[PDB]
């Protein structure tokens, strides 16, 4: 589908059994969700933005499922306002920005 | 032009007759751009990103030339950790993100 930017670039994404609302969003480099007690290994990163850095885990390889389509890679969890789908995932489904 | 997402996607932008590189944020809302001097009536602003708040300088109707597009519109100035094109000149531009 095509996603005009006249409001946030919100879109339903899965992961295991939790729907949520999130951001297609071009400027970051990797996809950050809220707060969730995923399986598996992670390990701690910290990463910046507006306002300073927050703390993070880094889990590899969860399948993310984005408006029907399959993706799977890295996802960092931690207290972020807002779920945010980075260019590591939104180049699997097939994303660009067109003007 | 069509952008893909394997790379940031930074832009030169003109600005007051300076280039600048600057990354397409569709997860910004606002323009937010490094320290620099711009002429005419600011306001105070503060804003909030991923770690936490920051206050910014807001500038009105600031023509920012984006890929060879034009646009006139708000830039936020402040401690950004880069400079980054939010979805308020996005849409002047014609930018969609499609998939
Ligand atoms: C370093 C370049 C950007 C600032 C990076 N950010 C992505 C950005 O899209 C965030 C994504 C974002 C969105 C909402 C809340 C927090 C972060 N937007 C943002 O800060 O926009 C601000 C300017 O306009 C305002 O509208 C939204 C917040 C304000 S980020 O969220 O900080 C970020 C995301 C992912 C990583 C790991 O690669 C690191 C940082």
Do not use: S
């Amino acid at each position: 589908p095509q996603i005009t930017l006249w409001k946030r670039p919100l879109v339903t994404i899965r992961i295991g059994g939790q729907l949520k609302e999130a951001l297609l969003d071009t400027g970051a480099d990797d996809t950050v969700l809220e707060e969730m007690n995923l399986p598996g290994k992670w390990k701690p990163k910290m990463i910046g933005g507006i306002g300073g850095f927050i703390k993070v885990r880094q889990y590899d390889q969860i399948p993310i499922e984005i408006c029907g389509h399959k993706a799977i890679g890295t996802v960092l969890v931690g207290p972020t306002p807002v779920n945010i789908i980075g260019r590591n995932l939104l180049t699997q489904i097939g994303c660009t920005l067109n003007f």
